[PDB]
Structures are given as structure tokens and as C-alpha cells.
Design a protein around this nucleic acid. Sequence first.
RNA 1: AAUAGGAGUAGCUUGGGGACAUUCGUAUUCAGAUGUCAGAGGUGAAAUUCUUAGAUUUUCUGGAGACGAACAACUGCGAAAGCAUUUGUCUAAAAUACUUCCAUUAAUCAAGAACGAAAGUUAAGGGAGUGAAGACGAUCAGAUACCGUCGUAAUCUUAAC
RNA 2: CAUAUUUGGUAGGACCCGAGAGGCUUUGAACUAAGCGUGAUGAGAUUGAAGUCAGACGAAAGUCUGAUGGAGGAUCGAGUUGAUACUGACGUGCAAAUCGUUCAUUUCAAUCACGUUUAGGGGCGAAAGACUAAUCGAAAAGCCUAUUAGCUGGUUAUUUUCGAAAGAUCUCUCAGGAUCGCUGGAGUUGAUUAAUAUAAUUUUACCAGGUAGAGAUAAUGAUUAGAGGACAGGGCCUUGACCUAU
RNA 3: ACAUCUCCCUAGUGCAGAUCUUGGUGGAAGUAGCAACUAUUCAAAUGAGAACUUUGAAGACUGAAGUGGAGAAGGGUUUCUUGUCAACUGUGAUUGAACAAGAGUUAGCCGCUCCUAAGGGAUAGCUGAAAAGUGUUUAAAGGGGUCCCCGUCUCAAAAGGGAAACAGGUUGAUAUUCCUGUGCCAAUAGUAUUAUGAGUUAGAUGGUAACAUAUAUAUAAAUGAACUCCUUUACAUAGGCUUUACACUCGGGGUGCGUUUUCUUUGCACUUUACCUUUAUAACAAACCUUGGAAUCAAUUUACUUGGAGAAGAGGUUCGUUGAACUCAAUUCAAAAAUUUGUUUUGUAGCAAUAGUAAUUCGUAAUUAUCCGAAGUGGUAAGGACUAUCCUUGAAAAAAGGAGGGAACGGCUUUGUGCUUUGCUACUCUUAAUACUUGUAUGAGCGUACCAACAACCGCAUCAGGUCUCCAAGGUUAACAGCCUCUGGUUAAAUAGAAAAAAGUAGGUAAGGGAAGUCGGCAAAAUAGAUCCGUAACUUCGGGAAAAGGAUUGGCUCUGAGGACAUUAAUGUUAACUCAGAACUGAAACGGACAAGGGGAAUCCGACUGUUUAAUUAAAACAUAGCAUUGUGAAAAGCCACAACUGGUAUUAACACAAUGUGAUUUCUGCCCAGUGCUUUGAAUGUCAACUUGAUGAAAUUCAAUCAAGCGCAGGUAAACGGCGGGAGUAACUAUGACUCUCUUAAGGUAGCCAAAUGCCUCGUCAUCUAAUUAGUGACGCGCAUGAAUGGAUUAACGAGAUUCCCACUGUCCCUACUUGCUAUCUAGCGAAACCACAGCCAAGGGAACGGGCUUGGCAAAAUCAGCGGGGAAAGAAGACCCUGUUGAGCUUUACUCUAGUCUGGCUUUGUGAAACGACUUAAGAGGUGCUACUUUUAAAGUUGUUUUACUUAUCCAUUUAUAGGGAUGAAUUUCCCAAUAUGGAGACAUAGCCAGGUGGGGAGUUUGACUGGGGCGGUACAUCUGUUAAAUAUUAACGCAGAUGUCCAAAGACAAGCUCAAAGAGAACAGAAAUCUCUUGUAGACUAAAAGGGGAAAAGCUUGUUUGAUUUCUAUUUUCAGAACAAGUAGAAAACGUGAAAGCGUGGCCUAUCGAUCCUUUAUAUUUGCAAAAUGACGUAAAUUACUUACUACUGUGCAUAUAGAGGUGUCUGAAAAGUUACCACAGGGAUAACUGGCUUGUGGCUGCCAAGCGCUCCUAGCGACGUAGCUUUUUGAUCCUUCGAUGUCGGCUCUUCCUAUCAUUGGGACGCAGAAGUCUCAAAGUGUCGGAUUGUUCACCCGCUAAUAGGGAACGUGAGCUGGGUUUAGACCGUCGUGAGACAGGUUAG
Length: 247
Amino acid sequence: GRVIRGQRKGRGSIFKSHNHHRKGAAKLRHLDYCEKKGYIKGLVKDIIHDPGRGAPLAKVIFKRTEKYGKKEELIIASEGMFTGQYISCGTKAPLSVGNILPIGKMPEGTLICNLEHRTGNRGTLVKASGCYATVVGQSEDGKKTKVRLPSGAKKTIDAKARAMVGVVGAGGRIDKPILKAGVAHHKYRVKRNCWPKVRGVAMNPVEHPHGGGNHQHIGHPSTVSRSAPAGQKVGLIAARRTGLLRG
RNA sequence: AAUAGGAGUAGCUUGGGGACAUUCGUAUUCAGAUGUCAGAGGUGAAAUUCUUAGAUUUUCUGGAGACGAACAACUGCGAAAGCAUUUGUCUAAAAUACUUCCAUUAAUCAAGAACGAAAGUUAAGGGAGUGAAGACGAUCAGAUACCGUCGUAAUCUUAAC
RNA sequence: CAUAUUUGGUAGGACCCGAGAGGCUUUGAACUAAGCGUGAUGAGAUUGAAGUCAGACGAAAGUCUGAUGGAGGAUCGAGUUGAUACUGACGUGCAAAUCGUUCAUUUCAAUCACGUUUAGGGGCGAAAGACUAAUCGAAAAGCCUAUUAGCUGGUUAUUUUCGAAAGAUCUCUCAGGAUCGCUGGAGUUGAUUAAUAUAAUUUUACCAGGUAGAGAUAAUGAUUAGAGGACAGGGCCUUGACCUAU
RNA sequence: ACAUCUCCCUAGUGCAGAUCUUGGUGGAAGUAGCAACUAUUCAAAUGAGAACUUUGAAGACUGAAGUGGAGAAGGGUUUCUUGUCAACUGUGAUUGAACAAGAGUUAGCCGCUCCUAAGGGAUAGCUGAAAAGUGUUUAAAGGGGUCCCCGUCUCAAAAGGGAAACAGGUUGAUAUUCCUGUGCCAAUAGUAUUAUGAGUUAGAUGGUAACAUAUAUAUAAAUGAACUCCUUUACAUAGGCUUUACACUCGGGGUGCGUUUUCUUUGCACUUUACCUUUAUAACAAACCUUGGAAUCAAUUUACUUGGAGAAGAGGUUCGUUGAACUCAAUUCAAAAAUUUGUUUUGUAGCAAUAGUAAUUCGUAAUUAUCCGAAGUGGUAAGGACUAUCCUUGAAAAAAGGAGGGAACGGCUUUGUGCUUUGCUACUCUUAAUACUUGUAUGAGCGUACCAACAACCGCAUCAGGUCUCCAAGGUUAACAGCCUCUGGUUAAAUAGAAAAAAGUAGGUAAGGGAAGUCGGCAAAAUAGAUCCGUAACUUCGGGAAAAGGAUUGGCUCUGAGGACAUUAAUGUUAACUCAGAACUGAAACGGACAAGGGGAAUCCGACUGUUUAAUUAAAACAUAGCAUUGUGAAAAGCCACAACUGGUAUUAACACAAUGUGAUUUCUGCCCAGUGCUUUGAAUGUCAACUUGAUGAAAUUCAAUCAAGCGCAGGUAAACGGCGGGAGUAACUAUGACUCUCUUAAGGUAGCCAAAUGCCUCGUCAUCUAAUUAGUGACGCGCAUGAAUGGAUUAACGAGAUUCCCACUGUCCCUACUUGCUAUCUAGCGAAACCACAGCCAAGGGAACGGGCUUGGCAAAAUCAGCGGGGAAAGAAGACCCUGUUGAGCUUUACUCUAGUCUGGCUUUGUGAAACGACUUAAGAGGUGCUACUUUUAAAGUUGUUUUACUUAUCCAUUUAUAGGGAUGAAUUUCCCAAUAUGGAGACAUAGCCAGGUGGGGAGUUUGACUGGGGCGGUACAUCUGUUAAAUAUUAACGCAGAUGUCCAAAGACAAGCUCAAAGAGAACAGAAAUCUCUUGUAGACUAAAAGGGGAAAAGCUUGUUUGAUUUCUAUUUUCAGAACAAGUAGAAAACGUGAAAGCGUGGCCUAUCGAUCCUUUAUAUUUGCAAAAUGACGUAAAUUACUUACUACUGUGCAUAUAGAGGUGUCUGAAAAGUUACCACAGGGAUAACUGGCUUGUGGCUGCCAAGCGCUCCUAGCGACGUAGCUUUUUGAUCCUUCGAUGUCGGCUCUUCCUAUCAUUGGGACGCAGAAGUCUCAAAGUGUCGGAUUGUUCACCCGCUAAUAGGGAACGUGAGCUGGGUUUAGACCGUCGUGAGACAGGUUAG
């Protein structure tokens, strides 16, 4: 028939992300010898808003270890971070909020954010506003550490991999309801080309397979296998249970 | 200076009074193991139910929610509602004592206000057991009930009511 | 056998003309769609949120009342952007959608410009199969291509001679085809001896019949009456059936 | 230049036609027409000629959102002057944006040009046959530095960023650009001179401070390297406050003109001032500093702001506005004083009056005189300080600037080696100018007309269309509105004139009533501005709301309220306009024109602001917040793209991304996991692939064996798809049925809801509204076919929403009339088209069944002008409807066949050890019936295959400018101990390649018969068999009739032999109507496998005996019929037999039915064959023996191929492997075929009869009239398919006319069951009449009312170039039911 909207989205085109307002990639400090063996203290010089990210960025100054003068990083701002706050990063760094530490050096039940799945990958996990991970265990012979993702899922990473003490800024953001369609427009204007998000069942069956039927019938199961073709994967892929969640 | 009232001061006074943090125990439950081999659960009496893919039963780890038993009483505190693990913090309270201070401040109170079990509402968590609803097996003259097995909403916490 | 010409059949454009299409390679986003960057543009009025002040009452908690204040995808609203209705005018137009009057829109999901992105079973779509340059349920350009068409239309001087069928069989066959029938040409045989062969004809012989007719007293199926006789019903008598000729 | 007919060859060889092709041309026709946009007149001039050329005078208009200026796109000499009139300038034409000849656009400073962005193109790579797809990503690469330190490139904005020019003048046409004047900017090489200030005997100063300081012609010059850090460039929206400028107004003096009978100390015009001088100062909102030290809070804005983290106060300083303000400068005199203040005189601060304006005189073109005092409005624009909002915080680089840092450092003379130590003291900097040398030592290139539409661009064109941006006067007013005015512009629009009716169109206006109108109050009218009152139900408490409903409003003369300055609380000087009150006044008229809500009572749907079908569609559809759901923790994830490599989501990370469903609020969301889905666990486990492994054979082969997934088994899931019953009985009246019973499911509909845009029946029943209610509204609810995220139920606000009603209101209507403009009309001018077989009076007839022509009748006498719509089955477009095609296309599925995707298994890439598990080999032993022969057990001894695991170098990922080996809100630049692949992570699994099973409407390609009383459900008349239809040989059709068929049979076959059946009567224990037995009678009345019809009695039936001929081979034939096939038969023949005593009979069934090509498969069969140069018995039988000896032999490997014979099947049966769907559709045909008329018929409908049994007290017939029976008609409905599908416009209403009679009334009568009054049946009669509403889509129907009565029909179902568009019936949409679905519905609804 005619290609479905989700399949059309991957052709790239006008569906590339709206990066104009966005201030640079939010990746943490890279691992180095100074971080590995000791620690570095830096100063948070400014806090700035990014709208692609759910929370602010923090402009942090370190002094060039291999050379001379001042170097600026962009860290994700923890809640309770402030301008003129001192941030410490490294193996021998003290335990305190917003510090950047290997997960092995956290005491259990601590709350942390900006986890990395491998050492020096620069905070690839736990980046959204108000969010946090919990350390849920430390290996008896070391090397591994067990942490709990903000989904509630438990995962085991190497102890060497870094994370950032405390919770991400701008928490409770989802608690306010969306007031109006213009507010929704302003949100999508800085995000992605993705909206208005029209129903599939309304359309021609030709142009979305939930479509057709004189009185807008679905006419076929809405639960789809993950083994299905991409153009067939319009419905609920690999749906273990459907209906209202209960218990 | 009231066998009235208020305020003070004193004592390693008192107590499950209130709030916040903290911490322990146990059963239960889940997951990971563990060893068995036929039944195990369940009742007026059974069946529904679970079990050879190893149930029930044994012992161990790790997690989780829940509660605080026995001790514990013609026992304590609280305005009442209500309040029982450990320690800490912030708090209030009454009596006793007083050759301490005040000098009638009082009593009970339409109006108005605060707090107010259980359930109910609304939102976030959390959601183990228990378990309104609901589902089966019976029971029985029939039984939509008592009884059995399963089991959502709720019970728990925060935030409003 | 060779050769000349013919006519018929078959393949080819094959009597000329006619589709809807299908494939291949390019070209378009000046319109229009959605997105982006850089810029602009939006008379005038109306309502009067929060906060602030003042005053009043209230033991208290608190409550009122008047200003101030200046909120809102708030209100009306010229214009701008549209385009509801008059099924208005117009309907060989001023115009292959205009014009008049009415009406919606007017501070935001706003409007406008320019530049820019995404291209054909592809895009893009606040979904109507919408739009993608007077082009769309698959754009434009060129080609395979003179595509194919059992179907529609047309198919050109003269005289003379013979002159039909619209039955049949099989057919994914019923608007068609093939093959039979009927027709023509060409030849040969027979014929010329008033004949024999021969014949949509009768004659005399000779058969074969079961339709019209006719029948119920011949059978079958019906079917209306009485009469004569030796198992049953009614209330020793009567009714029937049943036999027998009608 | 032409012939040949003398003969003969050859051909692009003969036209009326093809909606033929091409070209020309007519009738239509001097007609249609030249109608947007308020208007021209007079005179003159030019010229051949003037309504529309030019000049003047008038009249007018555009009316600062301008037909006015400017600019962008686009055009491109269209510009301008000078000519000019063949054609053009839809009239005229002397005009011209036509034609001809020329002329004309001048830049260091305005743009472009430059910079980067969104973007684009490449290098580096890497893929891909290439083409291309990508773009730092596995690089030995443009800059700065005494060999070192940095670095992907490149194009991309004529509105972002971006140095630097203004004023006046001037041309026929350009001017920021030419000219005059004044400036501004960037560079501006070397050397030598000079002047300018610094510093020296290697870097100034003041100020407590914030900070300030060079005034040289010229504010020049105030040390500084590497290496660093900032800042400008550089940014949203909204609301007020404020400052300046231009604009606008008033008042005074000065100038000229204007009005001037009368009045006016009047009206108008002019009274000018730029950049540039870090312009100097003044002023002010801010910011900051010194002092100061505040609760009794103060300072303070429209707004709140600020303060011991130091406010008020006092005194400064800075920035920004501004741009001659103010002592600003000079001079003067007085005082300060060894430099400062006061007073006088000057000056538009320079630019600057010489330039501008109004003037004034004087002619070759020159002079003179003039040019300024106060203020107010708040319209533009900009800035400022602020304040608020975002689940959104609002580009970048080039370029420029500031700060940190502390590298480097006189000149002369001289040893030693550009470096170092000694001796000496105008020197070292720094701007500008000059001279001299060094290529020629200053200013690149492009654009610059005109239009910007009122004719230059796009629209096929001087097209009422479209087309971006800025400039914005006066009055009225809220006002950039509307109306009128000044500046500037224009009076051209494809024409004029004359006349003025119809008709048209744009407008007006109308008595009395007031929606009786129609689809609907459509249209039109009424309302309407402000100020003052007053404002309900209901409500999510915000709204409703300008609700509703009232009142007031002119002009004049008064009164009050609201400022600013300065004299000590009073007195003065002095302003803008707005409000409020009161008199008087008038035709109570007054928002006067001008703009300018109609409302209410309700129902229904969508909550809302939003959006949509460009040109028939704005909504009830879509979006939307809100609710809910699924998947995914990550480079080996989700989700998507690409051929490949590689991308995108992703500058991402669960408060996230992707995928869905529902759709504000409110209230809730019952049951079912069976079905169809999706999903969870797996060797116990059924099935289930390649490779692999073993067994077999001589091998090919043939066999087994193997934890693959999948399915299957077993769970989970309904806010997955979806679904949600039927009967009986039952209560002291009557009724119903809580209650009882029951079959049945996966569950049997719970909360609700209703004849609702949801109820077939149905216009359901009751109310209520009305006058009348199929409508509306409230109800009821066994509901064809309501109902719970298919979201149900309920909702205020809200609507270019759908619907009803009421009030005001009205020319909708009674019932039309009068009127204006513009047209029409007539003239002059210019001047088409569609259409057109030939044509053009009727009536009837026949006819292809409705004729303009034909036949017979009526008839029929030129030419026209103005109209009009009866006809030309008028025009058009190859019927969009319907049917048909072995044409399509679109769409869907559990149609057929695939396939991208995807999962899983296998092999390669793919290495190295260790442990555990098996096999094999070597060592030692053992056992057996005569110098000679054989076989077995044990080592975990030696080698090898497997499972587990460790290791990394393969491989893969990540990371960084590839930066110390491991262990205890400053500033950073010239340990100790242990140790001796860029870094981690993953890793022989991935991955990739190649195979393989599975999944796979994501995508591809395709199929979805025929007959057919149209199409379709149905049937088979589609292969067949009987009788009959069938008309006496035979032949013969229909969806003719009555039927049968797809077999059955080891006997029900074959032969022989014997027998006679059905029945009836008469008899016999149990025993009867039927049981068995007997006698008599018995032409078949039985039976013959099965249909129906034929035939059959010593049988063809029944019983019995023997058997398998129901056998092999072959003809001639007969049937169907081609006289092919197949199938069925008949008569024989050649065999072998079976049976009978023999004759004989037996080649299936007593006869007429019981069935299937090619290709393919399979088993039979053969002294017959083949597998392509040869062979496979067998060296057989002989001889020979040095050997490639020599003869002679019917019988010769596996496998495949044949040949002949069957069988396995095609029932759409002379033989495709083939489902749905289109109201999104297209094409080819079709009157070979529906829906429309007509036609035939008249079943059905309607009308009229005949009769005589009854009814009519009594009485056949006054009136009736059955049971019966005859006609007529086509206003009924049918039957039909002759006519038309290259089109006869598909219902109804309105309007308008005519015909009929089968008369309802009026006229004349007849009869009566008739006393009259009536009334009833009836005849001549078609002259005349036959109505208002309510309800409808409506013929019809049905109320209410009038009437005098409210008859019935025809006219192409009267009447669409007469209208209307409500309805059936295009494309959008809704609900129910049905369909898995897409979709469907003479089911309902809205928009077209």
C-alpha cells in the first residue's frame, strides 16, 4: 500500500532531532590517570538549561593536568548542586553528593545517578530529571558491583565504572499535567517531528493497517509478535499480558 | 496569699504521651540452591486445588513486604480518637516539693475553631500475607450463604481530603 | 524436380484506426505538503486572575469591602488571513472557480517572506486517499511500442455470370473459434444413339406402425347410481361392507 | 513537353462518407456582443479629419489601508529625446507601453562583493561490476613559533553578522555615485632627515576611593614575548511607566496674497538648519564609591522594590540617553587672587548663510531687503529603567577589545668567541611631515534605466484575477474604521450618442394583517454606540452576562470637580482638556447621517482554543489535553532506514525512546482464555529439516540414527480480536409472574439507556405542545438489531454545528403595485462562437409497435421588427447508472505461488593449553581332538575423537588531543613501598559469508467458470439413463413434465436338472385377523439387486447339482455420431476349457443406466530391444602352447530408457493448479441487457353487467342481492423485453393551460320502502364550480376548519434551456445489524 508513519520515520529526512536549542552532548568527564590513581576537585561555575535533556547542565572548571590554564566540562546538574559548589572526581575522592566515584567505592543502599555501563563511557545511564539508581550490593571478592536501575531492574557492572552521587535535578516535572495543545506544541518544537499523533484506526487500511471498516473496525488482533515484519509491527509487539494492569 | 487559679524553680521525677531519624527479631513469601520419591493441600465428609517438568517435607543463602509475640496484668500513659522492637534527636505532661513569684487572673460556656477509629474519595509509591468484589468445588430440597480452593479493589507509606 | 504466377492458411504491425494498462531510464517541492534556519508583521476597544494597599468586623482562627494591580491557546473587533450563507451575481465570464453582499479569523498550535530539506508504489498527509507546477486510488518526460483488443468505427472504377447461411458437432463455450452443412471456381468421368444411369412423383405388389379416433360390459388408474344374493354395525328387525349381474 | 489499344512487365493504382488527415470555406450573423470601477462640459490649439490628442476654463473624483511615494522578485531598453502612422494600439486615434533614428544608467564611503548558519559539494576512508551510497570514520595533510608548537577542506544569507558620506546644486532622461562645499575610513615599504611629546645621565602620572589624566595643526605616544583567561559580535514574549525626536495644534510679532454689498484687527501661505566637531558642556533614568550608621521601620514605584551580606542622609564618580540644552565662548567692569566669581557688551557653537523660502527692484542676466518670540496635543518611532510568563529560556563565526603572565633590552671604543669583560657619556623611544631609493608605492570588480502593475511580472492578452516590503497629512471619532477635506494624483478603464416599454439585474418603497410561506423565517426587516439602572434558570462556581428588561442622549447660558509656578496660614502670577450637576430652548428631534448583538425556552452531538476534502464538503470527521496499554537497561538493547558498507531515533537513556488504543470535566467500567491472537516453560514430551553419524551393497544407490526451531502438549493474558440464550408452569377478584421446573454455553447483558442523527413491525401506547402533531417534547421499554475504553451513562462553558418551539419582527404571504440606477432598445463604430443529413404547419393512420417530410384528410399567399420558451424525442460527452469482456486497476484474507524482513540449525573464518568422557594402538597373561598351523583376556601403558573449562594473538566493541607501571566561589606555564601490545571491555562465542528448516499480506505476481424468462440466492436442464412431452418409420426443443445415476453381486455369475408363483375358498391340537400343515381353485393378479418402462410359466421366477467363460487373442460392425474419440453393445472367428446324456449353451448380470484424454506414476509381459569406439555368462567348448595363438558357441553386471497391457483422475465429466472485494475506481463494447416513457396483454386493481336463493314487517327485484356467471378499462400493480445505453435529464412540489366523463354540486327530470321536511336509487347533461390550514419526501394518507359542494381522471406517470433541489442516487461523515476482513445493508441519518 503506502508506507506507515513509523517506517517512514527511519528514512531520516525531517525526522532528525531538533538540536538547535541543545547545548552539546552531556557526557561526563573521561577517565584518565589522575582520576584513576587519585582525585581532582573542580568548581561548578554555572548551571544552564537544555530542553532536550530533562534537567540542567553544569559548567565545571578543571585546570589542564597535562598543560596550563582552565578547561570547561558539561556535567548533568544534580539536585542541590549550586554555582560555586566544589565537585570532586576520582578513586580517592571523598563520598559526598554530586561527586563522581567508581561504583565499587559506594557503601550499599546509597543513591546515585549518571551511571556508565563500562568505565570511561561517560555517564550513559541514569540521566533523566529527578531520577536515581541505588547500589544494592558489592561483590565479596570485588571486581563487580550490583546496582538498581530507575526502572527498578537490577544489573551487575564492574566496580571500576563511575557514577555520580545523589539524584538528578528538575524532579517532579511529570507531576504537573500538560495544560494545553500549545504547551504540547512547544514541547515537540524542541524535541522531534512526531506530533500531532493521529490514530491508525481512523485512516485508510492502505496507509495504516489498523485502518478501514465502515464504522472504524480494528477487525484483527492488536497483539503482534516481535517475529512480525516491520510494516506489520503497528500493534502491541510481544505483549505478554493486555487489559488493565492489576495486582 | 484561697485544702481556687496561673507562672517559676528542684529531683540519674515518671510513663507503650506526640514527631523525626535509627535499628533488631521472627514467622511468612519470592528467587537461587539442597536432598528425597508419591502423593500433598483441604472438610461434618469430601471434592475443586497443587504434585514425576519432582509437590508436600529437610537444610542453607540472598531479597521483599508485614508485624512486634511469649514476656503482658480486674498493668502504664494519652483531651478524646489512640498509643507497645533497639538506640538517638527534637518535643511536650502530671504529680510530688517549695517560708519562689503574681494578686483574682476564675468556673461552665450559644457563635466560631482545632483534633477526631474503621470504611469511603483523589493522587503518587509499595502491592508480601490478609483479602469487600469476582470465580469455581461442594453443602443442601434448592444455597447465588455459612464451609473449602482461587482471587482482583482495599489493607501498608507519603501527599491531600 | 525446377520455375512463373494465383489463391487459401500461419507467423509477423499483417485491412486501416482505436483502449484501461504493464515495464525500463531520467526530470520536478517556483505551486502544493510537512520539517528546518534567518528575518519580519499583526488599528482599536471589552473583561479584570494572582500579587499589593487601605478600611471594617472578628479573643481567636479568620472573614468581608473599596481601590490598586494587570493574568488569560479570555471577549468584541477593523485590517490581515480565510470563505458560512444568499444553492447571490456570473455561468460562449472580468475569471477553465471571478465578482457582490453576508459571514469566520485577528496574540498565537498566529500570519508573511526568503533560503532550505524530504521524489514516484516514492515522498509528505491535524487522514479527506489529501497533496506532490490548470497533471494523481500512483506526477511529468522519453522509450520497449506500430504493445495487446474474440470488441466499436471506417475499408476506394464499370459490366456480365453462378449465388448462400442464420441447422449441426466439440469448445472456460454461449457477442468467439474450429470442424459439418449449404456456395463458387477448376478439372476429370458420363453423355450425345429421344435413352440408360437417374428422380422432395405416382402405380402395382409388398411390408412396418399404435398418434388422431374409439373404449369403460378388455386390463390399469378413476368413477355415479340402484338391483339381486350369505361377515360387521345399529336398535327378532334393520343398516352396511362383501360377493353377482348391471 | 506530351502518348502508345502494338506487346508485355511493374506498382505507394482508382474514395462521398472513417466524431477520416490536412488545408481552405460557408449558413448561423452585421447578429451575440464591446454593462466591475458615481461625470463630464465649454472654449481654444494642432491636424486631412477630434466625444475619448494637446492647452485653458469649469465641473467632479482618488481621499494617505491613496490610481501618491519608494524599494524585492520577475521582466529588460519597455526608459528618454527626436521623428512618426503600412499593420497593431478588440471604438475613433493626429495618441501610444506600436514602428524609425538616435541618446542615456558614472561609487575607497550605497549595495553586492566578506563572514559564518540552516544547508550543499568534496578530500581522507570504505563499500558497490561500475554508476553511485556515504562523509574523520583505522590520515605520514593550513596556521603560529629559533628545527619546534598547533590544524579536515570547500561553497552556502542582495532582509542574520559585517568600516567608511552627508548637505546643497544640476540634466531631455542618473544622481549618497555627476557638480560645489564640507568630511570620514582603511592601508600608508625601505633608508635618511626633520619638527611633536616621552624616558636617560631598563618602562609616565593624579585621585582615600569609585575613578581620572597627553587638546601635539592632529587626544598622537601611558615597555612588554611565549603561553593563558575573559568580553563585544550576540539575540524570546507580554504589560505598563518614562525620556527624546519628527509630526500635529494654539497664541504673538514680521512678509505677501485672498474674502471684503454687509460683518470680520480675518483666511491662507512663508517665518528654514543636516551629517560632521572621541562634538564641548548642561540635563536626567540608572550603576558604583567615600562618608553616614537606621525598628517607632525608613527610603520608595502606576506596579514592588532596597537595606548591618550597610539603608536613609551627605558628598562624589561612571555609563547610557541625548546633541549648543546651560555661562557656552569671547569681551566688560567689579570682587576672588599670584588664578576664581558676579555685572555689561557681543554671537543662530563651528558647520551656517553665501545655502533654502516668501519677497523686492533692475532685462545682458543681475541686485537690494527678509528670515522669530512663547506654549500645548500625545499620533509615530526609538531608547531606558522595570515587572511578569515557559514541562519553551530564545544561532554562530569572521572580526575587534580588555585582563593575566613576566621572555627581551642604553650608544661609542676594545680584547677573546652575531656572543662576552674592560674605558667613556648628548642618547633610547614616539606620532606626523619631508627627501631619497627600491617594478609604474592609493583606493579592485560587478550592479545603478523603467515598471513594480491604476497596461510593463504570472494568468496563451494593454485580463474587474494573483503578486512581497516600507513611508502615512486635516476634520468627525475609541479609531490607522466609515464619511468628507489638504498635499500629491486622476477624470483612462475594449466605445459613444438618442430614446425609453417589456423583460433583466443592482436597488428603493409600500395600506391592513403578521409566517396563514417554504425543505427550513431562506431572503429582507427588527436589534445595534455610549452613560445610568437592573439582570434568571443553571453552573466544573470560573461563568451564565452586553443575559433578560428598562431609562437617557440635540443646541445654548450657567454652576461644581480635577494643575503649575512665588510672596508667611492667607495673598498673588498662571494651563491643558475631561468629567458631574442645573436652567432655558425646539415639531420629545437628538448613537439624527455614520457605524451598529435579534432574543428567549429547549433537545442532540462534539468538551474546549485548534485542523481538514486547492475548484460542488468546515462537520457530528480529525487534532487536543486527560485515561490506559505494550516493548526496551543499550554498541551482541528497543524501534526504523540502506544493495552493500553504513545510517536514523541519538547533542538520546526509563520523570526516556519507540509503538498503540481511547478522547475535557463528572460518574463508572459487569461476565467469558473456549474460538481466533499474542505470550510463558521444556527432553519427561508427540510430530518435525539440511548437514552430520552408522549399517548395507562391487559401487552409485538403498536404509537407519541425531534435545533445531516451529507446531503439538501445558500454562498466562479481554482498557488482545471478539462474544454476551431459549422454553414451560406458578399468587384469597382480574391481570401479571417475585417463585418453580427445564434444555443449553466460553459467557448467556450487570450499572445504565431508549421508538434518541440508534425501534423492522411502526406514523408502537400514554401525556404535553398546536386548532389540527407521522413532527417536537416528557414518558413507557420481552430492545428486528441498546449497553460498559467498539468506551457506556452524565454534563456547565462553548459552536459559520444538527434539530423544535415561543416573543419581538417583517412585501415570506394574503396580493401585488409604484419607483431609481445600470442594461436591454435605436443609430454610428468595431464584431465572434456553439450549433448545422436535408430541413422546417397540422391531424390521424399504418411503420422498428410516440413522424418535419410517408398514405389520407385538414389546408396553404410575400417580406419582416420586438419578444418568448410548446416542439425540433434542441445543444454537450463515445451512459459516470445497469449488463458484458476469459481488458484492467485499486483494496483484503486462514485464495494460489512466492518474497523483503525475521528466528533457528549447520559449515567456513576460528587459535593456544588444562581437566573430565569414549575409541584405537603397543606391552604382559590365557585357551583348543596331529618337528608343522590357530585364537582370547588384562594395563587407563601408547595414539586419537567428545564435554567442561582457562588463555589470549584471530576477531569485536568502547575510549581519548590514544599523555606517569602498581600499592599507603583563590593561585598553580619559560614522597615511601612493590614492579621492570595506546588504554579498557568482550573473545574463539560473536560477527561476516554460504547453505538449510521455520516464520512471513510487510512486499510482489496472479486466480476467483457457465447455463441463466435480465442480476442473484437457488437449481443443473453442465456427464448421463427411463417413460412422457414428440404431432402412429425415424428425427425433435424449453429452468417441459414424472423421475432415476456415480453402485451392488463368489452369487443375485455360468451350465444343467427339478419345480411354480401372488391369491382365494374349504379343512386341522396349542392357534386367534395374521404362524405351520393339507386338499381344491389359481395366464402370473408373484417375482425378476436397485429407477421407470419393456420381456419372461416345462422360465428369464423359485429349489437343487456341478462349477468360475466375470478366460486369452482378433475382426466385421451397431449405438452416440464427424457417421472421429471414448463408453456401451451385436454377430462371428483363433485358443484353452466349463457344463450337459447328447443336441447344445457359456466371451458377465433378461433388455434399456451404473462412467474418463495427453503427460505422469505403478505393476505385469518379451529365444523382441537400446544406453552411441569397446567389454562385465565364461576363457563355455575344442584344438594349440615359444603367444596379443587359433577356431567354434540362442540364452551375460547394477541403474536408467523403451515397447505392449492394465490400474491410480480429471462429476464445470472431448480433461486450467485458483478466494473475497470496489458507494475510490478506470477502459472496451452493449438497447444482443435493467432502472424512464411508449407498445402488446389485463393476471391483479378499478368500473359496468346478467341472474333470483335469501334479505328488505309483509313483499324476488322500492332498495338490495348472494351462491354463481358476462363484459369493459388501463388513473393501479404486474407479466413483458419490441423501441432507445457515441444519453429521451432519474421523484415530488410549485406554477400554467387544455381535453375527457365512468356527474360530486349547480339546470331539467324519472322512481322510491314518500305525508311534508328531508333523504335515497336513477337519466339527459362536461355550460359552470370544486377551498383555508395542521402533519409528510410523499402519490397516497390522516386530522381540524370553512364551503354550496370541497367529483374523478388524461395531457411523454402533464409541466427541470418554467422554477425548486426536500427526497432515491456520486465523492465526506454517523449509529445499528450483517461480513474474519476489506467492506455490505428498498436499514436508518447529516453534509454536499
